[PDB]
Amino acid sequence: MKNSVSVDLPGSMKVLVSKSSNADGKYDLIATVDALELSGTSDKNNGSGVLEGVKADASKVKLTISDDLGQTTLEVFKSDGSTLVSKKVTSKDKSSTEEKFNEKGEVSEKIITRADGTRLEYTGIKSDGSGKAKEVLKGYVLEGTLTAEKTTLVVKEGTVTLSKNISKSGAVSVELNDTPPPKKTAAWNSGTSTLTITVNSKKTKDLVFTSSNTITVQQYDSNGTSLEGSAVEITKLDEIKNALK
Amino acid sequence: MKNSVSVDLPGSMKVLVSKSSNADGKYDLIATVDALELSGTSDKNNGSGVLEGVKADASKVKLTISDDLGQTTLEVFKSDGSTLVSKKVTSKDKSSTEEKFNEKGEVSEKIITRADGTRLEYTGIKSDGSGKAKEVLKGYVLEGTLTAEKTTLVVKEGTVTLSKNISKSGAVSVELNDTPPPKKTAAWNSGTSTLTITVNSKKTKDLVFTSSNTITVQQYDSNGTSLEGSAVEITKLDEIKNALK
């Protein structure tokens, strides 16, 4: 710090590495990270090495810098120092991986940043690999979910589901499902001159064709077993068409 | 006509039947029908009997009245009198059946009126029983077609076809078809990271998923075998949704 050299780092950080060595050959590293003074003695005079620090709430902070000034590995622990909370790995080339762990020392969440600026954001992860997913792309977002084998991001339009699957090892594969909406059916009763229309095991309408040469609609209650209202006579084509929706 | 009695008739007609009998016991009938004087001698003094006449173009007109004043059967022939053109039967109770015949002495067309005021209108009839159909109902019209067995009147709304079938002997029966529109399918090429979308054996779009983490649409020509345009990149969700329609 005193008369030393400023080194820029992956992820908008600096370190100050001492101009000269110490008693045991080391170089002094000081970095203000987040807002803590972090400190450490390193074999090398470039910026590489570990820096440690303690938050005012007694959480332990450990910043590792990779030998080639490539990779800053920012770990946060619980007060004991044994129990990992969070971990931001940044890479040389602008890409980062913000993790989070749970009570058990198991990964809860994961924000992946990509070199371009696009993101994979996993949350609510569970013991059996599964959880939410978001993909931040340039201009728009693909939501989805996670499993042990794969991420699946989905986009829907009416009867079409587009499904972008990203495998564990990076492999994209895409698929499409068009599935028709539930269709009307009907049954004719010759006895009563009544068409009863069934949608998805729910009766919906009675269309009745009278000896008086006219047509009457009545609606099934949303139970789909008893009629409701009273019988509405038809007065032009349009109404018959309406009943068929 | 001279000093006789006016009888009203089925189908807005009158006849004048003579007050007294003739030489051979008959009663004189005169009717102005359409605009012809029609004439005939009848056994009975009520209005019943036949009346004949000749149009100025030499077509022969034959009006029959049923004994009970029930039914007026207006036939028109060709000039020869043997070859039927048209035939309007009216009934007592306001119902009528306007036929038409063809060159061969076979029925071409048929307007059925019903007592209520509703109509069945068959046209363009053919040797194998078939032809157009219209049903004039109170407030609206059901179009359709004819066969030897049956009339079929159809009403459509999107994927639904309502079909009212009237059998030879009057029997109504109704049916419904909901049939889903042609659905998208797609094939993935791992080689090129391209989804190709097929609608009804016609390729429609290429969706391409780039190593650059972006999506590009290109359209198939309406042949459904070669691409067209050039590859349009995607810029928000909405566009991806659009491609799925």
Curated annotation (Swiss-Prot), chains A, B:
Record GO cellular component, one term: cell outer membrane
Effect of mutating P10S: In strain: CA7
Cell location: Cell outer membrane; Cell surface
Membrane topology note: Lipid-anchor
Entry keyword set: Cell outer membrane, Lipoprotein, Membrane, Palmitate, Plasmid, Signal
Cross-referenced InterPro entries: OM_lipoprot_Borrelia, OM_lipoprot_dom_sf
PROSITE patterns given in the database record: PROKAR_LIPOPROTEIN (PS51257)
Impact after mutating I65V: In strain: CA8
Family per record: Belongs to the OspA lipoprotein family.
Function: Induces host (human and mouse) cytokine release by monocyte cell lines via TLR2 and CD14; nonlipidated protein does not stimulate host cells.
UniProt-recorded name of the protein: Outer surface protein A
